[PDB]
Amino acid sequence: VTNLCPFHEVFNATRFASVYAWNRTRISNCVADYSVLYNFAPFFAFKCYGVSPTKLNDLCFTNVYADSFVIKGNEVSQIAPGQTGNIADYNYKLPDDFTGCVIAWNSNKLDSKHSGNYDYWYRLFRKSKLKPFERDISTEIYQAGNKPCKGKGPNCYFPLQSYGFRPTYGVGHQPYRVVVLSFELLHAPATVCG
Amino acid sequence: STIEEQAKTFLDKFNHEAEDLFYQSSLASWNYNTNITEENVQNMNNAGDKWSAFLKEQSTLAQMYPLQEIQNLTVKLQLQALQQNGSSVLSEDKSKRLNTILNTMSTIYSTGKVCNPDNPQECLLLEPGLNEIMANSLDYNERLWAWESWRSEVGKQLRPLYEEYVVLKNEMARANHYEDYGDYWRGDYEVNGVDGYDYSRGQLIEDVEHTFEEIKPLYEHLHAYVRAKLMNAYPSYISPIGCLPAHLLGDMWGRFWTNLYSLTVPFGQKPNIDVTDAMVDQAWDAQRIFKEAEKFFVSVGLPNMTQGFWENSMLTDPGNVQKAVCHPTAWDLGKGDFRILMCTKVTMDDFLTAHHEMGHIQYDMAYAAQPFLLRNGANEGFHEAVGEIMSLSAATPKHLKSIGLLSPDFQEDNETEINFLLKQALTIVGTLPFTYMLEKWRWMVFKGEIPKDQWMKKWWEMKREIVGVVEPVPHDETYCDPASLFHVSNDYSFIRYYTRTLYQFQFQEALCQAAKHEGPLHKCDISNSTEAGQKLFNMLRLGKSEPWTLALENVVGAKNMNVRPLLNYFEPLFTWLKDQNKNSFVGWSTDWSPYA
Ligand SMILES: *[C@@H]1O[C@H](CO)[C@@H](O[C@@H]2O[C@H](CO)[C@@H](O[C@@H]3O[C@H](CO[C@H]4O[C@H](CO)[C@@H](O)[C@H](O)[C@@H]4O)[C@@H](O)[C@H](O[C@H]4O[C@H](CO)[C@@H](O)[C@H](O)[C@@H]4O)[C@@H]3O)[C@H](O)[C@H]2NC(C)=O)[C@H](O)[C@H]1NC(C)=O
Ligand SMILES: *[C@@H]1O[C@H](CO)[C@@H](O[C@@H]2O[C@H](CO)[C@@H](O[C@@H]3O[C@H](CO)[C@@H](O)[C@H](O)[C@@H]3O)[C@H](O)[C@H]2NC(C)=O)[C@H](O)[C@H]1NC(C)=O
Ligand SMILES: *[C@@H]1O[C@H](CO)[C@@H](O[C@@H]2O[C@H](CO)[C@@H](O)[C@H](O)[C@H]2NC(C)=O)[C@H](O)[C@H]1NC(C)=O
Ligand SMILES: *[C@@H]1O[C@H](CO)[C@@H](O[C@@H]2O[C@H](CO)[C@@H](O)[C@H](O)[C@H]2NC(C)=O)[C@H](O)[C@H]1NC(C)=O
Ligand SMILES: *[C@@H]1O[C@H](CO)[C@@H](O)[C@H](O)[C@H]1NC(C)=O
Ligand SMILES: *[C@@H]1O[C@H](CO)[C@@H](O)[C@H](O)[C@H]1NC(C)=O
Ligand SMILES: *[C@@H]1O[C@H](CO)[C@@H](O)[C@H](O)[C@H]1NC(C)=O
Ligand SMILES: *[C@@H]1O[C@H](CO)[C@@H](O)[C@H](O)[C@H]1NC(C)=O
């Protein structure tokens, strides 16, 4: 036991990222221990699809990707393979044969302001659905009419719509922090387990 | 691409913006209501102005999509609601004049007071002392003086204001496509575009009249009974066959006959069902009352309250410098926020009021999934009936015995049931003719069939015709009697109560039948049954998406109002009243007048 994979940086990072511009991390060439995840607060959802949660230390991989963002409480069910919805097909799409685990826990105390937290945005309009593991950052005036826009106005909207968080909101609208781990095989030495 | 999608995108954006703005406004209003300070008033005014302006510009933008190219039958309702409730057509000067008139009327009504004769030091107000004097004082002259003084002091000032107000309202309504402002109110029940469920504005009036024709006997019998009892109280003044004087109805206007229970009790020897002493002995408090109400609501299968409800709601009077209004209200601030405001005492009335408010809260919580513009009751009467049936079913001896407040040795018989039925009838049955007459007169004056110089005349004629009440002192056209009422002066519709009074009984009979209860209807409890709760929840979750006729058919299997459940409920009292009125004349003659 020499090198420990950093799981104290993905989790416990003060501020996360907007869902429409989610963050990606690469973990490799270290001994990964999954017992540190259970040291946190109870999780709203702990679902593992491709592998059993208990047998995570018996098989291992070559690369592990950690994706983190913040969404509403009732949109957690949309982070799953074969799901349809706004946030599912416009911001973050998962393949049907996805193998990994999804973590989500309440973060009301850290991501709420009395005046309002307007520092989280999500995409509301798009011309076409998103391919799996694709991101879109360009912000152009979305057109919904035959006439060209040439500026924001009627029938032409700003694609991004902002959240607003207050501590007095009920559960189901309060912020939730989500971490998605991914595993894969490829023709290369694994070197990531322990 | 097409008009429908262009409208759908706009609706999608409006749905997310309006929720945040409405939440800000509601939070400001709540913060002011629970805590009265000048800064709270300023914040409330700012939030209201922002919300009104935003609705104005959104309604202005909504005109781009014509309504004849949409067949989805759900987007159309949202667009129609936006256009209806955000449009302005009058000129700026006329709008300013109307706002000034409304504010002047509200201020005059709120600050109205009467000063004691030969004692200018003390001037009585309406809420603190006038209502108490009307309810409790047994002096004929004192009651007559208070009635006449209030009518003169709040009617003479508001008559020209009401004339200008009705002229402006008729002008605004005719500016729109409606015939007049009364049509504008009656349009709330209009349903179009669905086969087998269409409802026109002109139908409603007929329905109302028909229902009244089916309820005239019972009421008049009750009226006769009360008259006899009042003849036993004041022997000289009341004519044997004349109409009752207006100032002896137990309140200012005669809306309710509840205050007459003490004088007209059928059997005073029998003990009354009271649980205040039992609650005091068992050391109850507000939290226990609300927990019991929550348990009752759980017993039918409906979901119970959230943590935020308990943490944020206030259930006791703060006291000290903290001043707040103690009128019980149910707040739906949005974004999953529900609260109740009520200054609670350890009394049976508060025990029932807790259930009444939790019913409203449950109905608000039911349709949270619907779009923003459809999160409302089917019409203006469904919400009231849904709130009232819960209090209807929670005041039965069986429920109290199950809870444990009532002694198990208590038993029911003839006189207890008769007293309970008369107590309920003095509150429910009495207000229907008053409400019907007021709405009919207001519709007539909006139509223009009554010229101004005859207004009061016609009004008093109807008082002698329908309600059977005669004025104590003749009044000329200088007075404005109807404007004294709170709803009349503050521009509120007055037909929701009439529809609620029937919807509640229809719902109660349907739910009791679903629970397979046996026996008299007035002794029915649905605490443990789940089929009734399931049917009620199925109705509640709809929201405004479906027409009210379809929801009523889904619940009770009928497409219109019916008075049969009410008569079935009140039949045991009706038979006793018919038996008792054998030696008393039934009916009144309008020719008799107290002032010769
Ligand atoms: C479209 O625009 C219209 C305005 O034209 C909006 O209509 C309002 O709708 C609401 C909800 O239906 C109405 O609210 C109701 O007001 C009644 C009037 O009460 C007055 O008097 C009491 C004192 O007696 C005051 O406390 C109160 O503040 C009012 O000044 C209330 O009596 C009603 O309360 C009922 O429900 C509560 C629970 O919510 C129960 O606890 C009560 O016991 C009671 O059963 C109710 O609050 C409001 O009056 C309407 N406005 C007008 C001008 O009529 C629409 O909302 C809007 N549509 C939108 C925005 O979509
Ligand atoms: C009138 O327009 C409304 C608004 O679009 C239509 O409601 C829509 O109905 C479809 C099909 O029932 C809904 O699609 C569903 O989406 C969920 C994901 O949210 C998915 O899991 C389901 O399998 C289904 O595909 C759609 O959400 C719904 N729209 C809204 C805003 O709720 C309605 O069908 C239209 N009616 C007519 C007669 O055209
Ligand atoms: C009731 O309202 C008053 C004023 O509207 C509140 O007093 C303010 O409280 C905030 C935070 O507590 C202070 O920042 C302000 O300076 C106070 N204003 C004044 C004029 O003193 C009061 O806190 C409210 N009551 C409660 C229980 O919150
Ligand atoms: C609904 O269910 C409750 C729960 O069993 C019943 O409450 C019982 O009531 C009887 C009196 O009839 C008491 O002797 C029991 O102790 C109560 N049990 C509990 C657990 O509180 C209630 O009676 C039922 N409703 C009706 C109408 O019978
Ligand atoms: C992150 O962890 C550090 C130390 O482990 C702690 O001091 C800090 O409060 C944590 N912050 C959050 C948001 O969990
Ligand atoms: C994304 O992750 C990188 C790598 O840790 C970090 O430097 C950056 O601050 C993150 N950005 C956001 C918006 O979280
Ligand atoms: C009622 O509230 C309690 C909390 O005291 C909760 O445990 C219970 O699940 C709620 N009822 C239902 C039907 O969920
Ligand atoms: C009183 O109850 C008895 C029960 O035997 C019944 O015969 C009688 O008609 C009742 N009388 C009244 C006035 O309710």
Side-chain angles (χ1 to χ4, degrees), chain B residues 369-383:
Chain B
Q370 295 283 344
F372 174 76
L373 288 168
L374 304 189
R375 281 175 207 167
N376 216 350
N379 52 1
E380 49 190 2
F382 267 39
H383 213 278

PDB file of all heavy atoms in Angstrom, chain B residues 369-383:
ATOM      1  N   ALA B 369     -48.071  18.857  -9.142  1.00  0.00           N
ATOM      2  CA  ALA B 369     -47.401  18.428 -10.363  1.00  0.00           C
ATOM      3  C   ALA B 369     -47.931  19.117 -11.614  1.00  0.00           C
ATOM      4  O   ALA B 369     -47.281  19.048 -12.662  1.00  0.00           O
ATOM      5  CB  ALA B 369     -47.525  16.912 -10.526  1.00  0.00           C
ATOM      6  N   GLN B 370     -49.084  19.772 -11.532  1.00  0.00           N
ATOM      7  CA  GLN B 370     -49.663  20.430 -12.689  1.00  0.00           C
ATOM      8  C   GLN B 370     -48.857  21.675 -13.057  1.00  0.00           C
ATOM      9  O   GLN B 370     -48.094  22.194 -12.239  1.00  0.00           O
ATOM     10  CB  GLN B 370     -51.116  20.801 -12.410  1.00  0.00           C
ATOM     11  CG  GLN B 370     -52.028  19.607 -12.204  1.00  0.00           C
ATOM     12  CD  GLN B 370     -52.390  18.923 -13.504  1.00  0.00           C
ATOM     13  OE1 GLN B 370     -52.218  19.487 -14.584  1.00  0.00           O
ATOM     14  NE2 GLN B 370     -52.891  17.698 -13.409  1.00  0.00           N
ATOM     15  N   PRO B 371     -48.995  22.161 -14.292  1.00  0.00           N
ATOM     16  CA  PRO B 371     -48.318  23.406 -14.677  1.00  0.00           C
ATOM     17  C   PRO B 371     -48.750  24.573 -13.801  1.00  0.00           C
ATOM     18  O   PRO B 371     -49.731  24.512 -13.058  1.00  0.00           O
ATOM     19  CB  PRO B 371     -48.746  23.607 -16.133  1.00  0.00           C
ATOM     20  CG  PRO B 371     -49.060  22.239 -16.617  1.00  0.00           C
ATOM     21  CD  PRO B 371     -49.649  21.516 -15.444  1.00  0.00           C
ATOM     22  N   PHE B 372     -47.986  25.664 -13.902  1.00  0.00           N
ATOM     23  CA  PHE B 372     -48.182  26.792 -12.996  1.00  0.00           C
ATOM     24  C   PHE B 372     -49.562  27.415 -13.159  1.00  0.00           C
ATOM     25  O   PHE B 372     -50.217  27.756 -12.167  1.00  0.00           O
ATOM     26  CB  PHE B 372     -47.097  27.844 -13.220  1.00  0.00           C
ATOM     27  CG  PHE B 372     -47.303  29.101 -12.427  1.00  0.00           C
ATOM     28  CD1 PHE B 372     -47.022  29.133 -11.073  1.00  0.00           C
ATOM     29  CD2 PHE B 372     -47.782  30.248 -13.033  1.00  0.00           C
ATOM     30  CE1 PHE B 372     -47.213  30.285 -10.340  1.00  0.00           C
ATOM     31  CE2 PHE B 372     -47.975  31.403 -12.303  1.00  0.00           C
ATOM     32  CZ  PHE B 372     -47.690  31.422 -10.955  1.00  0.00           C
ATOM     33  N   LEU B 373     -50.024  27.574 -14.397  1.00  0.00           N
ATOM     34  CA  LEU B 373     -51.294  28.246 -14.637  1.00  0.00           C
ATOM     35  C   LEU B 373     -52.502  27.357 -14.379  1.00  0.00           C
ATOM     36  O   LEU B 373     -53.635  27.843 -14.464  1.00  0.00           O
ATOM     37  CB  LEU B 373     -51.347  28.779 -16.070  1.00  0.00           C
ATOM     38  CG  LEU B 373     -50.449  29.983 -16.354  1.00  0.00           C
ATOM     39  CD1 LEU B 373     -50.363  30.239 -17.847  1.00  0.00           C
ATOM     40  CD2 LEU B 373     -50.961  31.212 -15.625  1.00  0.00           C
ATOM     41  N   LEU B 374     -52.298  26.079 -14.070  1.00  0.00           N
ATOM     42  CA  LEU B 374     -53.395  25.156 -13.819  1.00  0.00           C
ATOM     43  C   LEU B 374     -53.447  24.664 -12.381  1.00  0.00           C
ATOM     44  O   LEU B 374     -54.305  23.836 -12.057  1.00  0.00           O
ATOM     45  CB  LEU B 374     -53.302  23.958 -14.771  1.00  0.00           C
ATOM     46  CG  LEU B 374     -53.280  24.286 -16.263  1.00  0.00           C
ATOM     47  CD1 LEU B 374     -53.410  23.021 -17.092  1.00  0.00           C
ATOM     48  CD2 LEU B 374     -54.380  25.271 -16.614  1.00  0.00           C
ATOM     49  N   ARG B 375     -52.560  25.145 -11.509  1.00  0.00           N
ATOM     50  CA  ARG B 375     -52.544  24.730 -10.105  1.00  0.00           C
ATOM     51  C   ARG B 375     -53.626  25.500  -9.354  1.00  0.00           C
ATOM     52  O   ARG B 375     -53.367  26.465  -8.632  1.00  0.00           O
ATOM     53  CB  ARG B 375     -51.172  24.966  -9.488  1.00  0.00           C
ATOM     54  CG  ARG B 375     -50.138  23.916  -9.831  1.00  0.00           C
ATOM     55  CD  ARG B 375     -48.782  24.310  -9.282  1.00  0.00           C
ATOM     56  NE  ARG B 375     -47.688  23.743 -10.058  1.00  0.00           N
ATOM     57  CZ  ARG B 375     -46.423  24.127  -9.955  1.00  0.00           C
ATOM     58  NH1 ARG B 375     -46.057  25.079  -9.114  1.00  0.00           N
ATOM     59  NH2 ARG B 375     -45.504  23.541 -10.716  1.00  0.00           N
ATOM     60  N   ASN B 376     -54.866  25.055  -9.528  1.00  0.00           N
ATOM     61  CA  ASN B 376     -56.006  25.696  -8.886  1.00  0.00           C
ATOM     62  C   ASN B 376     -57.171  24.718  -8.885  1.00  0.00           C
ATOM     63  O   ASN B 376     -57.149  23.693  -9.569  1.00  0.00           O
ATOM     64  CB  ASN B 376     -56.382  26.999  -9.594  1.00  0.00           C
ATOM     65  CG  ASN B 376     -56.855  28.068  -8.633  1.00  0.00           C
ATOM     66  OD1 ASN B 376     -57.087  27.800  -7.454  1.00  0.00           O
ATOM     67  ND2 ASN B 376     -56.997  29.290  -9.130  1.00  0.00           N
ATOM     68  N   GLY B 377     -58.192  25.049  -8.103  1.00  0.00           N
ATOM     69  CA  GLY B 377     -59.397  24.248  -8.081  1.00  0.00           C
ATOM     70  C   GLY B 377     -60.162  24.355  -9.385  1.00  0.00           C
ATOM     71  O   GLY B 377     -59.946  25.250 -10.201  1.00  0.00           O
ATOM     72  N   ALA B 378     -61.087  23.411  -9.577  1.00  0.00           N
ATOM     73  CA  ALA B 378     -61.841  23.360 -10.825  1.00  0.00           C
ATOM     74  C   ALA B 378     -62.601  24.658 -11.065  1.00  0.00           C
ATOM     75  O   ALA B 378     -62.637  25.167 -12.191  1.00  0.00           O
ATOM     76  CB  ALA B 378     -62.796  22.169 -10.812  1.00  0.00           C
ATOM     77  N   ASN B 379     -63.213  25.207 -10.025  1.00  0.00           N
ATOM     78  CA  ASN B 379     -63.785  26.547 -10.081  1.00  0.00           C
ATOM     79  C   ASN B 379     -63.672  27.154  -8.686  1.00  0.00           C
ATOM     80  O   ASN B 379     -62.936  26.646  -7.833  1.00  0.00           O
ATOM     81  CB  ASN B 379     -65.226  26.507 -10.618  1.00  0.00           C
ATOM     82  CG  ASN B 379     -66.098  25.522  -9.878  1.00  0.00           C
ATOM     83  OD1 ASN B 379     -65.652  24.870  -8.937  1.00  0.00           O
ATOM     84  ND2 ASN B 379     -67.351  25.410 -10.298  1.00  0.00           N
ATOM     85  N   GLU B 380     -64.401  28.239  -8.447  1.00  0.00           N
ATOM     86  CA  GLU B 380     -64.287  28.966  -7.190  1.00  0.00           C
ATOM     87  C   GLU B 380     -65.049  28.312  -6.044  1.00  0.00           C
ATOM     88  O   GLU B 380     -65.044  28.856  -4.935  1.00  0.00           O
ATOM     89  CB  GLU B 380     -64.771  30.405  -7.375  1.00  0.00           C
ATOM     90  CG  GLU B 380     -66.115  30.519  -8.066  1.00  0.00           C
ATOM     91  CD  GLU B 380     -66.446  31.944  -8.459  1.00  0.00           C
ATOM     92  OE1 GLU B 380     -65.604  32.836  -8.228  1.00  0.00           O
ATOM     93  OE2 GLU B 380     -67.550  32.172  -8.998  1.00  0.00           O
ATOM     94  N   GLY B 381     -65.698  27.174  -6.274  1.00  0.00           N
ATOM     95  CA  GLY B 381     -66.467  26.535  -5.226  1.00  0.00           C
ATOM     96  C   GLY B 381     -65.912  25.207  -4.754  1.00  0.00           C
ATOM     97  O   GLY B 381     -66.230  24.757  -3.649  1.00  0.00           O
ATOM     98  N   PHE B 382     -65.088  24.564  -5.583  1.00  0.00           N
ATOM     99  CA  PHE B 382     -64.561  23.249  -5.231  1.00  0.00           C
ATOM    100  C   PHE B 382     -63.674  23.312  -3.995  1.00  0.00           C
ATOM    101  O   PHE B 382     -63.767  22.452  -3.109  1.00  0.00           O
ATOM    102  CB  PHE B 382     -63.789  22.664  -6.411  1.00  0.00           C
ATOM    103  CG  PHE B 382     -64.617  21.796  -7.310  1.00  0.00           C
ATOM    104  CD1 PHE B 382     -65.921  22.139  -7.616  1.00  0.00           C
ATOM    105  CD2 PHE B 382     -64.091  20.638  -7.851  1.00  0.00           C
ATOM    106  CE1 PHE B 382     -66.683  21.343  -8.445  1.00  0.00           C
ATOM    107  CE2 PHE B 382     -64.849  19.838  -8.680  1.00  0.00           C
ATOM    108  CZ  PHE B 382     -66.148  20.192  -8.977  1.00  0.00           C
ATOM    109  N   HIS B 383     -62.805  24.321  -3.920  1.00  0.00           N
ATOM    110  CA  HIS B 383     -61.857  24.406  -2.814  1.00  0.00           C
ATOM    111  C   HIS B 383     -62.583  24.580  -1.485  1.00  0.00           C
ATOM    112  O   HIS B 383     -62.229  23.945  -0.481  1.00  0.00           O
ATOM    113  CB  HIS B 383     -60.889  25.564  -3.060  1.00  0.00           C
ATOM    114  CG  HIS B 383     -59.513  25.330  -2.523  1.00  0.00           C
ATOM    115  ND1 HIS B 383     -59.181  25.544  -1.204  1.00  0.00           N
ATOM    116  CD2 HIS B 383     -58.378  24.920  -3.136  1.00  0.00           C
ATOM    117  CE1 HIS B 383     -57.902  25.263  -1.024  1.00  0.00           C
ATOM    118  NE2 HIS B 383     -57.392  24.884  -2.182  1.00  0.00           N
TER     119      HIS B 383
END
